[PDB]
Amino acid sequence: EVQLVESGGGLIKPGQSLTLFCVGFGFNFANDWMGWVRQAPGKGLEWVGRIRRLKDGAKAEYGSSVKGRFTISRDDSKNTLYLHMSSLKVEDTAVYYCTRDEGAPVTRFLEWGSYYYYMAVWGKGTTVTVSSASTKGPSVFPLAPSSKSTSGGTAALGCLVKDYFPEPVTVSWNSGALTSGVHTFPAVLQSSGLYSLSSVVTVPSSSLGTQTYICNVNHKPSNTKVDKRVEP
Amino acid sequence: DIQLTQSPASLSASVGDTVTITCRASQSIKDYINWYQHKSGSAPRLLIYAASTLQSGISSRFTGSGSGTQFTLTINSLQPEDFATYYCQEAYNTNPTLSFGQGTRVDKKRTVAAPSVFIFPPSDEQLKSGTASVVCLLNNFYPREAKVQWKVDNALQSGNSQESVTEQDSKDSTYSLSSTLTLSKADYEKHKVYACEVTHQGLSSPVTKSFNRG
Protein backbone atom coordinates (compact mmCIF):
# COMPACT_ATOMS: atom_id res chain seq x y z
CA GLU A 1 0.00 0.00 0.00
CA VAL A 2 2.56 2.58 -1.13
CA GLN A 3 0.81 5.93 -1.48
CA LEU A 4 2.05 9.45 -2.29
CA VAL A 5 -0.20 12.50 -1.96
CA GLU A 6 0.82 15.94 -3.21
CA SER A 7 -0.68 19.19 -2.00
CA GLY A 8 0.02 22.93 -1.95
CA GLY A 9 -0.92 23.56 -5.56
CA GLY A 10 -3.02 26.43 -6.82
CA LEU A 11 -2.74 29.88 -8.33
CA ILE A 12 0.36 31.99 -7.79
CA LYS A 13 1.76 35.08 -9.55
CA PRO A 14 5.04 35.32 -11.50
CA GLY A 15 8.03 36.20 -9.33
CA GLN A 16 6.39 34.73 -6.23
CA SER A 17 7.24 31.70 -4.10
CA LEU A 18 5.22 28.58 -3.30
CA THR A 19 5.90 25.30 -1.47
CA LEU A 20 4.50 21.94 -2.58
CA PHE A 21 4.19 19.05 -0.16
CA CYS A 22 4.13 15.31 -0.62
CA VAL A 23 3.28 12.87 2.12
CA GLY A 24 4.30 9.23 1.69
CA PHE A 25 2.37 6.31 3.17
CA GLY A 26 3.14 2.60 3.40
CA PHE A 27 6.91 2.56 3.00
CA ASN A 28 10.14 3.37 4.84
CA PHE A 29 10.38 6.98 3.62
CA ALA A 30 13.71 7.68 5.39
CA ASN A 31 15.46 4.95 3.41
CA ASP A 32 14.46 6.13 -0.08
CA TRP A 33 15.37 8.47 -2.88
CA MET A 34 12.46 10.85 -3.45
CA GLY A 35 11.77 13.28 -6.24
CA TRP A 36 9.54 15.42 -8.43
CA VAL A 37 8.44 15.34 -12.09
CA ARG A 38 6.14 17.83 -13.84
CA GLN A 39 3.94 18.07 -16.91
CA ALA A 40 3.02 21.40 -18.46
CA PRO A 41 -0.34 21.66 -20.26
CA GLY A 42 -0.19 19.93 -23.62
CA LYS A 43 3.40 18.86 -23.06
CA GLY A 44 5.30 15.74 -21.98
CA LEU A 45 6.92 14.73 -18.68
CA GLU A 46 9.88 16.73 -17.35
CA TRP A 47 12.11 15.80 -14.43
CA VAL A 48 12.31 18.46 -11.70
CA GLY A 49 14.66 16.99 -9.12
CA ARG A 50 15.53 14.41 -6.50
CA ILE A 51 16.94 14.13 -3.00
CA ARG A 52 19.12 11.37 -1.55
CA ARG A 53 18.45 9.67 1.79
CA LEU A 54 19.86 11.37 4.89
CA LYS A 55 22.26 8.48 5.60
CA ASP A 56 24.09 9.31 2.39
CA GLY A 57 24.11 13.07 2.88
CA ALA A 58 20.75 14.16 1.48
CA LYS A 59 22.18 15.85 -1.62
CA ALA A 60 19.48 17.36 -3.81
CA GLU A 61 19.85 17.55 -7.59
CA TYR A 62 17.77 19.41 -10.16
CA GLY A 63 16.59 19.46 -13.74
CA SER A 64 18.09 22.12 -16.00
CA SER A 65 14.92 24.27 -16.18
CA VAL A 66 14.73 24.84 -12.41
CA LYS A 67 18.27 24.90 -10.97
CA GLY A 68 18.84 27.97 -8.84
CA ARG A 69 15.15 28.60 -8.30
CA PHE A 70 13.85 25.51 -6.46
CA THR A 71 14.94 23.64 -3.33
CA ILE A 72 13.93 20.08 -2.54
CA SER A 73 13.96 19.14 1.14
CA ARG A 74 12.69 16.30 3.30
CA ASP A 75 11.38 15.71 6.81
CA ASP A 76 11.74 12.00 7.49
CA SER A 77 10.01 12.35 10.88
CA LYS A 78 6.79 13.26 9.04
CA ASN A 79 7.36 11.21 5.85
CA THR A 80 7.14 14.52 3.99
CA LEU A 81 8.92 15.70 0.86
CA TYR A 82 8.96 19.42 -0.05
CA LEU A 83 9.43 21.40 -3.24
CA HIS A 84 10.20 24.99 -2.29
CA MET A 85 9.79 27.12 -5.38
CA SER A 86 10.80 30.73 -5.92
CA SER A 87 11.09 33.19 -8.83
CA LEU A 88 8.17 31.45 -10.50
CA LYS A 89 7.45 32.01 -14.18
CA VAL A 90 4.42 31.33 -16.37
CA GLU A 91 6.22 28.34 -17.93
CA ASP A 92 6.36 26.66 -14.51
CA THR A 93 2.61 26.11 -14.89
CA ALA A 94 2.22 22.35 -14.66
CA VAL A 95 0.99 19.33 -12.77
CA TYR A 96 3.70 18.38 -10.25
CA TYR A 97 4.06 14.69 -9.38
CA CYS A 98 5.84 13.41 -6.30
CA THR A 99 7.87 10.24 -6.87
CA ARG A 100 9.41 7.48 -4.80
CA ASP A 101 12.56 6.57 -6.72
CA GLU A 102 14.94 3.63 -6.68
CA GLY A 103 18.44 2.85 -7.90
CA ALA A 104 19.09 -0.73 -9.02
CA PRO A 105 22.74 -1.78 -9.06
CA VAL A 106 24.45 -2.27 -12.43
CA THR A 107 25.96 -5.78 -12.43
CA ARG A 108 28.55 -5.45 -15.22
CA PHE A 109 31.90 -5.60 -13.40
CA LEU A 110 33.45 -2.53 -15.07
CA GLU A 111 30.48 -0.38 -14.06
CA TRP A 112 30.29 -1.52 -10.44
CA GLY A 113 29.16 1.38 -8.29
CA SER A 114 26.76 2.55 -10.99
CA TYR A 115 22.98 2.26 -10.76
CA TYR A 116 19.84 2.38 -12.88
CA TYR A 117 17.71 5.23 -11.50
CA TYR A 118 13.93 5.26 -12.02
CA MET A 119 10.69 6.76 -10.72
CA ALA A 120 9.14 3.71 -9.08
CA VAL A 121 5.89 5.10 -7.64
CA TRP A 122 4.13 8.33 -8.60
CA GLY A 123 1.45 10.41 -6.94
CA LYS A 124 -1.60 11.70 -8.82
CA GLY A 125 -0.17 15.23 -8.95
CA THR A 126 -0.93 18.77 -7.76
CA THR A 127 -1.69 21.55 -10.22
CA VAL A 128 0.25 24.82 -10.13
CA THR A 129 -0.89 27.72 -12.29
CA VAL A 130 1.47 30.69 -12.51
CA SER A 131 -0.29 33.73 -13.95
CA SER A 132 -0.71 37.45 -13.49
CA ALA A 133 -4.37 37.29 -14.54
CA SER A 134 -7.23 38.31 -12.27
CA THR A 135 -10.59 36.58 -11.91
CA LYS A 136 -12.85 37.27 -14.87
CA GLY A 137 -16.14 35.69 -15.87
CA PRO A 138 -16.67 34.52 -19.45
CA SER A 139 -18.31 36.27 -22.35
CA VAL A 140 -20.61 33.87 -24.21
CA PHE A 141 -21.21 34.24 -27.93
CA PRO A 142 -23.42 32.12 -30.15
CA LEU A 143 -22.05 29.92 -32.89
CA ALA A 144 -25.16 30.22 -35.04
CA PRO A 145 -26.28 27.49 -37.43
CA SER A 146 -26.36 28.74 -41.02
CA SER A 147 -25.59 27.40 -44.50
CA LYS A 148 -21.83 27.55 -43.78
CA SER A 149 -22.30 25.32 -40.76
CA THR A 150 -24.28 22.65 -42.60
CA SER A 151 -22.80 19.31 -43.67
CA GLY A 152 -25.11 17.09 -45.68
CA GLY A 153 -28.42 17.39 -43.87
CA THR A 154 -26.73 18.09 -40.50
CA ALA A 155 -26.41 21.51 -38.88
CA ALA A 156 -23.83 22.49 -36.24
CA LEU A 157 -24.41 25.11 -33.58
CA GLY A 158 -22.69 26.06 -30.38
CA CYS A 159 -21.43 28.60 -27.90
CA LEU A 160 -18.03 30.26 -27.72
CA VAL A 161 -17.03 30.81 -24.10
CA LYS A 162 -14.32 33.40 -24.18
CA ASP A 163 -11.97 35.36 -21.93
CA TYR A 164 -12.35 33.84 -18.47
CA PHE A 165 -9.96 33.18 -15.60
CA PRO A 166 -9.23 30.87 -13.89
CA GLU A 167 -10.40 27.45 -15.05
CA PRO A 168 -12.84 25.82 -15.11
CA VAL A 169 -16.13 26.56 -16.80
CA THR A 170 -18.89 24.01 -17.21
CA VAL A 171 -21.29 23.91 -20.15
CA SER A 172 -24.59 22.11 -20.61
CA TRP A 173 -27.33 22.35 -23.24
CA ASN A 174 -31.04 22.80 -22.49
CA SER A 175 -30.36 22.32 -18.76
CA GLY A 176 -28.92 18.87 -19.39
CA ALA A 177 -31.79 17.63 -21.58
CA LEU A 178 -29.53 17.71 -24.64
CA THR A 179 -26.43 15.50 -24.48
CA SER A 180 -26.50 13.50 -27.71
CA GLY A 181 -24.06 14.97 -30.23
CA VAL A 182 -22.53 17.50 -27.85
CA HIS A 183 -18.80 18.21 -27.75
CA THR A 184 -17.35 20.60 -25.22
CA PHE A 185 -13.71 21.22 -26.08
CA PRO A 186 -10.82 21.50 -23.64
CA ALA A 187 -9.97 25.10 -22.84
CA VAL A 188 -7.04 26.86 -24.51
CA LEU A 189 -4.91 29.54 -22.87
CA GLN A 190 -4.94 32.64 -25.09
CA SER A 191 -2.10 35.15 -25.50
CA SER A 192 -3.96 37.53 -23.17
CA GLY A 193 -3.65 35.06 -20.29
CA LEU A 194 -7.38 34.33 -20.39
CA TYR A 195 -8.95 30.99 -21.27
CA SER A 196 -11.43 30.16 -24.04
CA LEU A 197 -13.40 27.15 -25.21
CA SER A 198 -16.31 26.21 -27.43
CA SER A 199 -19.16 23.76 -26.97
CA VAL A 200 -20.91 22.50 -30.09
CA VAL A 201 -23.75 20.17 -31.04
CA THR A 202 -24.86 18.70 -34.35
CA VAL A 203 -28.58 18.34 -35.10
CA PRO A 204 -30.80 17.61 -38.12
CA SER A 205 -31.32 20.73 -40.25
CA SER A 206 -35.06 20.01 -40.03
CA SER A 207 -34.87 20.64 -36.25
CA LEU A 208 -33.86 24.30 -36.59
CA GLY A 209 -36.49 26.95 -35.98
CA THR A 210 -38.71 24.53 -34.11
CA GLN A 211 -36.32 23.24 -31.43
CA THR A 212 -34.88 25.69 -28.92
CA TYR A 213 -31.16 25.43 -28.11
CA ILE A 214 -29.76 27.13 -25.02
CA CYS A 215 -26.26 26.74 -23.72
CA ASN A 216 -25.83 27.00 -19.96
CA VAL A 217 -22.44 28.29 -18.88
CA ASN A 218 -21.25 28.28 -15.28
CA HIS A 219 -18.03 29.80 -13.99
CA LYS A 220 -17.82 29.12 -10.27
CA PRO A 221 -14.72 31.24 -9.56
CA SER A 222 -16.61 34.39 -10.60
CA ASN A 223 -19.99 33.05 -9.43
CA THR A 224 -21.44 33.73 -12.88
CA LYS A 225 -24.11 31.77 -14.71
CA VAL A 226 -25.07 32.62 -18.27
CA ASP A 227 -27.79 31.12 -20.48
CA LYS A 228 -27.42 31.91 -24.17
CA ARG A 229 -30.12 31.07 -26.72
CA VAL A 230 -28.56 30.03 -30.02
CA GLU A 231 -30.70 30.83 -33.05
CA PRO A 232 -30.16 30.31 -36.79
CA ASP B 1 22.83 17.05 -23.49
CA ILE B 2 21.07 13.76 -24.26
CA GLN B 3 17.91 14.04 -26.34
CA LEU B 4 15.44 11.18 -26.84
CA THR B 5 13.15 11.06 -29.87
CA GLN B 6 10.26 8.60 -29.98
CA SER B 7 8.60 7.32 -33.10
CA PRO B 8 5.95 7.22 -34.23
CA ALA B 9 4.22 10.10 -32.44
CA SER B 10 0.98 8.10 -32.44
CA LEU B 11 -0.13 4.49 -33.11
CA SER B 12 -3.54 2.90 -33.66
CA ALA B 13 -4.13 -0.58 -32.24
CA SER B 14 -6.82 -3.18 -31.88
CA VAL B 15 -6.99 -5.54 -28.92
CA GLY B 16 -4.60 -8.43 -29.57
CA ASP B 17 -2.27 -6.38 -31.77
CA THR B 18 1.48 -6.13 -31.30
CA VAL B 19 2.67 -2.55 -31.14
CA THR B 20 6.26 -1.28 -31.32
CA ILE B 21 7.50 2.10 -30.05
CA THR B 22 11.04 3.24 -30.81
CA CYS B 23 13.27 5.56 -28.76
CA ARG B 24 16.41 7.01 -30.35
CA ALA B 25 19.08 8.63 -28.18
CA SER B 26 21.32 11.42 -29.46
CA GLN B 27 24.29 9.59 -27.96
CA SER B 28 25.23 6.09 -26.84
CA ILE B 29 23.85 5.30 -23.39
CA LYS B 30 24.26 1.52 -23.07
CA ASP B 31 21.13 0.17 -21.35
CA TYR B 32 20.30 3.17 -19.11
CA ILE B 33 16.67 3.53 -20.28
CA ASN B 34 13.30 3.51 -18.47
CA TRP B 35 9.80 3.19 -19.96
CA TYR B 36 6.63 4.66 -18.44
CA GLN B 37 2.91 4.42 -19.18
CA HIS B 38 0.56 7.37 -18.63
CA LYS B 39 -3.21 7.30 -18.99
CA SER B 40 -4.93 10.69 -18.69
CA GLY B 41 -6.45 11.23 -15.25
CA SER B 42 -4.12 8.77 -13.55
CA ALA B 43 -0.55 8.76 -12.23
CA PRO B 44 2.24 7.63 -14.57
CA ARG B 45 3.43 4.05 -14.08
CA LEU B 46 6.90 2.57 -14.46
CA LEU B 47 7.03 -0.41 -16.84
CA ILE B 48 10.69 -1.17 -17.53
CA TYR B 49 14.12 -0.10 -16.31
CA ALA B 50 17.65 -0.95 -17.51
CA ALA B 51 16.20 -1.10 -21.04
CA SER B 52 14.77 -4.61 -20.60
CA THR B 53 14.06 -5.30 -16.94
CA LEU B 54 10.37 -5.63 -16.23
CA GLN B 55 9.23 -3.92 -13.04
CA SER B 56 7.51 -6.11 -10.44
CA GLY B 57 3.74 -6.26 -10.93
CA ILE B 58 3.89 -5.39 -14.63
CA SER B 59 2.54 -7.76 -17.29
CA SER B 60 5.08 -9.72 -19.30
CA ARG B 61 3.25 -8.53 -22.42
CA PHE B 62 5.51 -5.46 -22.13
CA THR B 63 9.04 -6.07 -23.37
CA GLY B 64 11.95 -3.68 -23.65
CA SER B 65 14.93 -4.06 -25.94
CA GLY B 66 17.99 -2.26 -27.27
CA SER B 67 21.36 -0.88 -26.27
CA GLY B 68 23.37 2.15 -27.32
CA THR B 69 21.24 4.60 -29.26
CA GLN B 70 18.15 2.64 -30.30
CA PHE B 71 15.54 1.25 -27.89
CA THR B 72 12.18 -0.42 -28.38
CA LEU B 73 9.11 -0.97 -26.24
CA THR B 74 6.95 -3.78 -27.60
CA ILE B 75 3.39 -4.28 -26.38
CA ASN B 76 2.27 -7.80 -27.23
CA SER B 77 -1.34 -9.00 -27.22
CA LEU B 78 -2.53 -5.46 -26.57
CA GLN B 79 -5.33 -5.12 -24.00
CA PRO B 80 -7.85 -2.26 -23.55
CA GLU B 81 -6.03 -1.02 -20.44
CA ASP B 82 -3.01 -0.32 -22.68
CA PHE B 83 -4.50 2.68 -24.51
CA ALA B 84 -2.24 5.38 -23.10
CA THR B 85 0.80 7.55 -23.74
CA TYR B 86 4.22 5.95 -23.37
CA TYR B 87 7.49 7.70 -22.50
CA CYS B 88 11.11 6.65 -22.58
CA GLN B 89 13.61 8.22 -20.20
CA GLU B 90 17.41 8.16 -20.00
CA ALA B 91 19.25 7.68 -16.72
CA TYR B 92 22.82 7.72 -18.03
CA ASN B 93 24.45 10.86 -16.64
CA THR B 94 26.26 10.80 -13.29
CA ASN B 95 25.08 14.38 -12.79
CA PRO B 96 21.48 13.56 -13.66
CA THR B 97 19.46 14.99 -16.51
CA LEU B 98 16.80 12.26 -16.60
CA SER B 99 15.53 13.44 -19.98
CA PHE B 100 12.24 12.04 -21.27
CA GLY B 101 11.19 11.33 -24.84
CA GLN B 102 8.27 13.39 -26.12
CA GLY B 103 5.76 10.56 -25.73
CA THR B 104 3.91 8.21 -28.06
CA ARG B 105 0.10 7.95 -28.00
CA VAL B 106 -1.48 4.53 -28.47
CA ASP B 107 -5.21 4.76 -29.25
CA LYS B 108 -8.03 2.45 -30.23
CA LYS B 109 -8.26 1.53 -33.90
CA ARG B 110 -11.54 1.92 -35.77
CA THR B 111 -12.58 2.26 -39.40
CA VAL B 112 -11.27 5.46 -40.98
CA ALA B 113 -13.85 8.28 -40.68
CA ALA B 114 -13.56 11.58 -42.53
CA PRO B 115 -14.49 14.68 -40.55
CA SER B 116 -17.64 16.66 -41.16
CA VAL B 117 -16.43 20.25 -41.44
CA PHE B 118 -18.30 23.38 -40.37
CA ILE B 119 -17.33 27.06 -40.29
CA PHE B 120 -18.74 29.84 -38.11
CA PRO B 121 -18.26 33.56 -38.75
CA PRO B 122 -18.03 35.83 -35.71
CA SER B 123 -21.26 36.95 -34.08
CA ASP B 124 -22.27 40.61 -34.39
CA GLU B 125 -22.21 40.83 -30.60
CA GLN B 126 -18.57 39.79 -30.48
CA LEU B 127 -17.39 42.44 -32.95
CA LYS B 128 -18.63 45.05 -30.48
CA SER B 129 -16.22 43.55 -27.91
CA GLY B 130 -13.32 44.35 -30.24
CA THR B 131 -12.48 40.79 -31.31
CA ALA B 132 -13.59 38.44 -34.09
CA SER B 133 -13.29 34.70 -33.62
CA VAL B 134 -13.84 32.48 -36.60
CA VAL B 135 -14.32 28.82 -35.76
CA CYS B 136 -13.69 25.78 -37.94
CA LEU B 137 -15.16 22.55 -36.52
CA LEU B 138 -13.98 19.07 -37.56
CA ASN B 139 -16.46 16.55 -36.23
CA ASN B 140 -16.25 12.81 -35.48
CA PHE B 141 -13.13 11.73 -37.36
CA TYR B 142 -10.50 8.99 -37.11
CA PRO B 143 -7.49 8.77 -37.01
CA ARG B 144 -6.56 11.74 -34.80
CA GLU B 145 -4.20 13.44 -37.28
CA ALA B 146 -5.74 16.42 -39.04
CA LYS B 147 -4.17 19.41 -40.69
CA VAL B 148 -6.13 22.64 -40.56
CA GLN B 149 -4.83 25.70 -42.39
CA TRP B 150 -6.42 29.17 -42.56
CA LYS B 151 -6.43 31.61 -45.46
CA VAL B 152 -7.78 35.14 -45.46
CA ASP B 153 -8.15 36.66 -48.93
CA ASN B 154 -5.88 33.89 -50.27
CA ALA B 155 -3.06 34.64 -47.80
CA LEU B 156 -1.87 31.84 -45.50
CA GLN B 157 -2.34 32.64 -41.82
CA SER B 158 0.43 32.08 -39.30
CA GLY B 159 0.39 32.63 -35.54
CA ASN B 160 -3.25 33.64 -35.06
CA SER B 161 -5.07 30.34 -34.56
CA GLN B 162 -5.41 27.79 -31.77
CA GLU B 163 -6.63 24.21 -31.90
CA SER B 164 -8.41 22.09 -29.32
CA VAL B 165 -9.08 18.36 -29.64
CA THR B 166 -11.36 16.04 -27.68
CA GLU B 167 -10.23 12.81 -26.07
CA GLN B 168 -11.04 9.73 -28.07
CA ASP B 169 -14.74 8.94 -27.72
CA SER B 170 -15.33 5.92 -25.49
CA LYS B 171 -18.28 4.72 -27.57
CA ASP B 172 -17.45 5.44 -31.22
CA SER B 173 -13.66 5.93 -31.00
CA THR B 174 -13.69 9.22 -32.92
CA TYR B 175 -12.22 12.64 -32.29
CA SER B 176 -13.48 16.16 -32.81
CA LEU B 177 -11.38 19.30 -33.23
CA SER B 178 -11.86 23.04 -33.22
CA SER B 179 -9.54 25.56 -34.84
CA THR B 180 -10.21 29.16 -33.89
CA LEU B 181 -8.76 32.09 -35.83
CA THR B 182 -8.57 35.30 -33.81
CA LEU B 183 -8.37 38.78 -35.28
CA SER B 184 -9.25 42.24 -34.08
CA LYS B 185 -12.47 43.79 -35.31
CA ALA B 186 -10.37 46.19 -37.37
CA ASP B 187 -8.79 43.36 -39.38
CA TYR B 188 -12.00 41.37 -39.85
CA GLU B 189 -13.54 44.54 -41.28
CA LYS B 190 -10.94 44.84 -44.04
CA HIS B 191 -10.58 41.38 -45.55
CA LYS B 192 -13.24 39.61 -47.60
CA VAL B 193 -12.76 35.83 -47.72
CA TYR B 194 -12.20 33.49 -44.77
CA ALA B 195 -11.35 29.84 -45.34
CA CYS B 196 -10.21 26.78 -43.46
CA GLU B 197 -8.69 23.90 -45.39
CA VAL B 198 -8.71 20.43 -43.86
CA THR B 199 -6.46 17.47 -44.71
CA HIS B 200 -7.42 14.10 -43.29
CA GLN B 201 -6.59 10.51 -44.26
CA GLY B 202 -10.30 9.77 -44.75
CA LEU B 203 -10.29 12.15 -47.71
CA SER B 204 -8.22 11.80 -50.91
CA SER B 205 -8.43 15.57 -51.31
CA PRO B 206 -8.55 18.42 -48.80
CA VAL B 207 -11.90 19.99 -47.87
CA THR B 208 -12.30 23.78 -47.73
CA LYS B 209 -15.13 25.57 -45.93
CA SER B 210 -15.20 29.28 -46.67
CA PHE B 211 -17.35 32.38 -46.33
CA ASN B 212 -17.37 35.98 -47.46
CA ARG B 213 -17.98 38.63 -44.79
CA GLY B 214 -21.53 39.99 -44.86
CA–CA separation, A103 vs A35, rounded Å? 12
- Verify whether the Cβ–Cβ distance B102 to A47 is below 8 Å: no
Q: How many CB atoms lie within 10 A of CB A8?
A: 16
Count residue pairs from A and B with Cβ separation < 8 A: 143
Residues of A in contact with B55 (CB under 8 A): 120
d(CA A6, CA B203): 46
Segment (H or E) for A97: strand A94-105
Q: Set out the domains of chain B in order of their start, with CATH numbers.
A: 1-109 (2.60.40.10), 110-214 (2.60.40.10)
Chain B residues with beta carbon closer than 8 angstroms to that of A125: 43
For A79, which DSSP code? Answer: T
Of B151, B161, B164, B158, nearest to B211 (Cα)? B151
- Go through the domains of chain A in sequence order and give each one's CATH number: 1-132 (2.60.40.10), 133-230 (2.60.40.10)
B176 CB neighbours in chain A (<8 A) are: 183, 185, 200
Resolution (A): 1.5
* B94 SS3 class: coil
- Tell me the C-alpha to C-alpha distance, in Å, between residue A116 and each of A56, B51, B69, B74, B149: 17, 10, 17, 21, 45
Q: How was this structure determined?
A: X-ray
Q: Tell me if chain A has a CB within 8 Å of the CB of B98.
A: yes
B121 at interface of A, judged by CB pairs closer than 8 A:
yes
The residue among B65, B196, B171, B62 whose CA lies nearest residue B121 is: B196
Note the Cα B61 to chain centre separation in Å.
25
User: B64 — contact with chain A (CB < 8 Å)?
Assistant: no
Q: From CA A178, how far away is CA A199, in angstroms rounded?
A: 12
Does any CB of chain A come closer than 8 Å to the CB of residue B42? yes
Return the beta strands (E) in chain B as ranges: 4-7, 10-13, 19-25, 33-38, 45-49, 53-54, 62-66, 70-75, 84-90, 104-108, 116-120, 131-141, 147-152, 155-156, 161-165, 175-184, 193-199, 207-212
Nearest to A92 by CA among A41, A52, A133, A155: A41
Beta sheet of B207-212, edge-to-edge order:
B155-156, B147-152, B193-199, B207-212
Contact B87 A44 (CB under 8 A): yes
Mutate to test the interface with A, among B2, B28, B120, B123 (most CBs of A within 10 A): B120
Closest CA to A67 of A82, A52, A86: A86
> H helices then E strands: how many in chain A?
0, 20
**Torsional class of A206: left (φ above 0), alpha (ψ -120 to 50), beta (otherwise):** alpha
